[PDB]
């Protein structure tokens, strides 16, 4: 019924390992099967550089990768099940940043939502 997003404020992991940035969302059009785009960006909401982008075709559960920085970002959540959780592989100290979760439906301009508050990823050495 309403757009909303569930994202923890903090995730910690050791450099060289893999971290999971969880993200789930609620949305209107509760059985939407149209074209979907999932985006993760870093640094700043709405304005930071994207680190991951995939898109799913109408009626398809496969979110095809359009962008994955260093090849180390991968979607774990099924977006047709309201899960946009992201896996970061082979973490580097430079990955210690704030990340923001974003989804875009097709249709009206307001069928899109990005986490106003992001998840801080802590990379331990």
């Amino acid at each position: 019924q309403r757009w909303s997003m569930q994202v923890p404020p903090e995730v910690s992991a050791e450099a060289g390992d893999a971290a999971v940035l969880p993200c789930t969302f609620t949305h209107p059009h509760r059985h939407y099967d149209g074209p979907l785009t999932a985006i993760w960006r870093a640094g700043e909401p709405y304005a930071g550089p994207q680190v991951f982008r995939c898109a799913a075709a109408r009626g398809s559960e496969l979110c095809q990768t359009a962008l994955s920085l260093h090849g180390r970002f991968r979607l774990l959540g099924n977006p047709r099940r309201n899960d946009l959780s992201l896996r970061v592989e082979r973490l580097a100290l430079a990955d210690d940043r704030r990340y923001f979760c974003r989804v875009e439906f097709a249709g009206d301009v307001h069928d899109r939502y990005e986490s106003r508050h992001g998840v801080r990823l802590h990379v331990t050495a």
Partner: antibody
Amino acid sequence: QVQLQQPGAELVKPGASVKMSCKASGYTFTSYWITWVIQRPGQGLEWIGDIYCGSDTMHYNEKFKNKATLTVDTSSSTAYMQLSSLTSEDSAVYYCARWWDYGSSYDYFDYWGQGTTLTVSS
Amino acid sequence: DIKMTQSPSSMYASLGERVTITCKASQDINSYLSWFQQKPGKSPKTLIYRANRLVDGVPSRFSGSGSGQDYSLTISSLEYEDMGIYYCLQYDEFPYTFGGGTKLEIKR
């Protein structure tokens, strides 16, 4: 030493436009987000919009989407809010405010400007 | 769109009283609730953010609490400087929405 300086007052004719300024000093301008807030006297506060001074990225209250325009001038470290087709219903105090670490779960407003009293009148 | 209702609209309190004002949101705002104090002719002043975090320099008699939809601010012993209007603000999603404010007047 953080400061956000707004002109104390502006008198503008109905129908015209006004460009309100919020001059920053004492910090790295491009690293922070600035928010604009309206206060009509005797009433409370209402959010107008946010702008990232490092990228000119803006988010607006839909209520103001045809009324207000947020810009920044990074050469003079000045944020601007333009209000068009002014009427007497626009007479109000307008604040700019700076966010600490916008986007962190721990962000908050860490500095308020003094506000501009806008009087719309012939 | 998210509605914010503060209680009370106004109140009288004495020096040294323990005062609590409340703010309720029409949705879960995930503890992104901030409190401001404003006196006539001056700009607002941020007191509390993330529902329970004190801005540095704010006196320890101020505290905030709450989760989901229900939030409060408490002054454990009122001082004369604590007069003013108090506003809550959800900044969980756009558009940000303020409460209508609580006018705190001192009885002496």
